[PDB]
Amino acid sequence: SMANINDSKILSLQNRKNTLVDTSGYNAEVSEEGDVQLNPIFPFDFKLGSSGEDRGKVIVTQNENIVYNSMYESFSISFWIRINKWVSNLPGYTIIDSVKNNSGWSIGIISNFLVFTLKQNEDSEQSINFSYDISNNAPGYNKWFFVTVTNNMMGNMKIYINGKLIDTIKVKELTGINFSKTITFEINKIPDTSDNINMWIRDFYIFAKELDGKDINILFNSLQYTNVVKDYWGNDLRYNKEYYMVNIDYLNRYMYANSRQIVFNTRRNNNDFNEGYKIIIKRIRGNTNDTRVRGGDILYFDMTINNKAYNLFMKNETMYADNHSTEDIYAIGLREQTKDINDNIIFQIQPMNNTYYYASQIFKSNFNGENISGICSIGTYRFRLGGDWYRHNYLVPTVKQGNYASLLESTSTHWGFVPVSE
């Protein structure tokens, strides 16, 4: 319960009815300048750009008293943020700034780092950061994430990402630090260090105390619909929409097909998701009020090749592997659509989110989801495809039936859905 956490909330920047407002009760003034885009749908984010003189700018001016009573001891700052395209060699940008007369705090991004800084004065600072895994994010860390910074002058400065502690350092003496009542959201290139980047922000809160990990996680979860499956960037997963389907174990592989067998090939364009075939998700059972995909939904997958649409389906053929057994393992392949929903095309999805990615698990299901018989995975098996006279190894999607529970903890069962730009 949020009740006790909220007693210490001193700023609650939100988009309410196409207006940015402070809902904390302290009535900070909120103003906008330039190109600021408000999202009318959940999560109600605002969007800023880095390019142009009409560059967007959100200015929050707080009541001087409430900052003075709060920030000099212990405080917490939390917010959802998304950056695109957050490439590994990004130049330096200040993004959320509360520095005045060379003192205050500020948040910036540079390379693969998001940085929170206490500025004591012109010559003194103390910073902490989150750095994303470059090897796991060649196309950029372009996903929504939840930041929480906590500070205690008699203790530590900490930063959390999606409810996990990432960095912590003892706060040094910061005699004479003066906190500003103004916070400015603007993507401001730092000169003495290219493409436009966008930043999306929603639910930017400040608390007048140091939140512990438990409360941070309660807050984290209170700001999400955890049964709404997410696409790779953290936005709601949708039916009837094209995605590139990826396996978490094999992000450098795109999805292809060969003789009605789906196979995974190595990407040529490692800095993008723009190769191979796309899938569209089709609802069999779920919430008909919208086209969002939810855990427990029954569904099937379509793939179009040369203007012809196929269903993904679980094959009933014996599988062959060099070393492993293949008991209860079945290839997922392509079959021609029919008038009726055949049992072998049917799956049930569940969200599977991680600190550093948004994915799902996909289970083989019957029409009503009363019989869940397997989980989708991936592996290297021997096939005769195309013109093959001999059997060759292909990396293919599979369903593991039998006692599939053993595979539940495997990242090989985690599937991401990257939205197509076109």
Curated annotation (Swiss-Prot):
<feature type="binding site" description="Sia-1 binding site">
    <location>
        <begin position="257"/>
        <end position="260"/>
    </location>
    <ligand>
        <name>a ganglioside GD1b (d18:1(4E))</name>
    </ligand>
</feature>
<feature type="binding site" description="Sia-1 binding site">
    <location>
        <position position="277"/>
    </location>
    <ligand>
        <name>a ganglioside GD1b (d18:1(4E))</name>
    </ligand>
</feature>
<feature type="region of interest" description="C-terminus of receptor binding domain (C-RBD)">
    <location>
        <begin position="225"/>
        <end position="422"/>
    </location>
</feature>
<comment type="function">
    <text>Responsible for host epithelial cell transcytosis, host nerve cell targeting and translocation of light chain (LC) into eukaryotic host cytosol. Composed of 3 subdomains; the translocation domain (TD), and N-terminus and C-terminus of the receptor-binding domain (RBD). The RBD is responsible for the adherence of the toxin to the eukaryotic target cell surface. It simultaneously recognizes 2 polysialated gangliosides coreceptors in close proximity on host synaptic vesicles.</text>
</comment>
<feature type="binding site" description="GBP2 binding site">
    <location>
        <position position="412"/>
    </location>
    <ligand>
        <name>a ganglioside GD1a (d18:1(4E))</name>
    </ligand>
</feature>
<feature type="binding site" description="GBP2 binding site">
    <location>
        <position position="250"/>
    </location>
    <ligand>
        <name>a ganglioside GD1a (d18:1(4E))</name>
    </ligand>
</feature>
<feature type="binding site" description="GBP2 binding site">
    <location>
        <begin position="378"/>
        <end position="381"/>
    </location>
    <ligand>
        <name>a ganglioside GD1a (d18:1(4E))</name>
    </ligand>
</feature>
<protein>
    <recommendedName>
        <fullName>Botulinum neurotoxin C heavy chain</fullName>
    </recommendedName>
</protein>
<feature type="region of interest" description="Ganglioside-binding loop">
    <location>
        <begin position="400"/>
        <end position="414"/>
    </location>
</feature>
<feature type="short sequence motif" description="Host ganglioside-binding motif">
    <location>
        <begin position="387"/>
        <end position="389"/>
    </location>
</feature>
<feature type="region of interest" description="N-terminus of receptor binding domain (N-RBD)">
    <location>
        <begin position="4"/>
        <end position="224"/>
    </location>
</feature>
